[PDB]
């Protein structure tokens, strides 16, 4: 995600595009004037056009234009649909040349000010073979040091099989080098070069750069201290941790061809917010196999969920086909177009081949529970109860002021799910199925870890979000939702400690 400049003004962006760019050069940056917003700056006809992009709780909104799940999917869309981006007057804005950012402060491997001893401590405790970081030098101001661990062990050791090597990086006229050879435009360029071609020591050791040092995993028992640091005002804040996570989104541009098919286009609440092909729910009840929904598996590729959009008039029947096929017994939803897909209390309705009875509704302060009976018409023996949890106290703007409501809600949802043997994935849906949906699911994943293992366990919020985002685009949308996840997990741990 080199075209994203985290710490530049609009004036700086214009000057950068006018001096180092040409017509078609572009970059993105966070809005300094409206928290959360972003600006896409594009050079056209020797001038710079600015395009406002709102990151709401539900999606990214190119103002006056279309919705997207992430900034990276937005840029990818227009980099491959040249001529689809136009002003209201109709004039085209072409995205041709990403203007690369040199700033490394948002990269997972960049630690800024850090002593050589501390770096060795961190790499010793948390590192394994190929763990690395880049730190400012204290012995050569302005220079940097790449510290990398190599060996066969993992963690603290005394067999000498593992070591930390410190590679000095000179900064000479805004260019970076390791003392010879190529001079790189940025630390990121240097780092990417040695990821592909690791440096070999004179005696043969290959300094493989396999993964950045993890700095975000914490012990759940120490959640308060991390939160207090992230909450400070004057930097290792929620903003910085979230920005670093966002910087990884170009690794999540998985294919979404099925959702792009013409016969499926009108089954999407937003035409550009689509399910990844490799995790989408495939309907095989035959027809049409498509629904805009993804399976979300915890510990993906190392309880499950279906993350999906609110139903459309023309997808209500598909929604119930999915619920039936997947043996889902619990639905989590919010409401704020997406259509009502259940009958009123005591009524029975058919949705295509599926029949649904609303047996009983129960009102709580934070949510309404609907006990639904689902069956396939002509086959009364297929009946099963689907418990629909309609969360009611999520504010129209931002996140709940106290996570207690969500937590008690998810606790009840968890117990309902756990009481039904062999129940399928919990279905979570609202709006586009990524914002609140991802927030609910990530909270539930993290809480479930603490359920099994207790307060003395490791949790990693951004790594968990990245893992969920590899299964559906843009899960967890905003820094407010990110902070809310931490607040919810903190509240949950404190509840258990007391």
Numbering used by the authors: 4 to 237, 244 to 295, 301 to 316, 325 to 358, 366 to 527
Quoted passage from the original study:
To further substantiate the conformational selection binding mechanism, we investigated SHP099 binding to two additional SHP2 mutants that were originally designed as catalytically dead mutants, with the active site C459 changed to either Ser30 or Glu31. Against our expectations, FL-C459S was found to be predominantly in an open conformation, with chemical shifts comparable to FL-E76K. If a negative charge is indeed crucial for the closed form, the C459E mutant would more properly mimic FL-WT. In agreement with our expectation, FL-C459E is indeed primarily closed as shown by NMR and crystallography making C459E a superior “dead mutant” that better resembles the closed conformation of wild-type SHP2. Strikingly, SHP099 affinities to all FL-SHP2 forms correlate well to the corresponding equilibria between open and closed states: FL-WT, -E76D, and -C495E are predominantly in the closed conformation with tight affinities for SHP099; FL-E76K and -C459S with predominantly open conformations have much weaker affinities.
The full-length, wild-type SHP2 (FL-WT) contains three domains: a protein tyrosine phosphatase domain (PTP) and two preceding Src homology 2 domains (N-SH2 and C-SH2). The binding of a phosphotyrosine peptide to the opposing face of the N-SH2 domain exposes the catalytic cleft to substrate and activates the system. In diseases caused by SHP2, mutations are often observed at the N-SH2/PTP interface (e.g., E76D/E76K), resulting in constitutively active protein and abnormal cellular proliferation. The recently developed inhibitor, SHP099, allosterically closes the protein and deactivates SHP2 by stabilizing the N-SH2/PTP interaction.
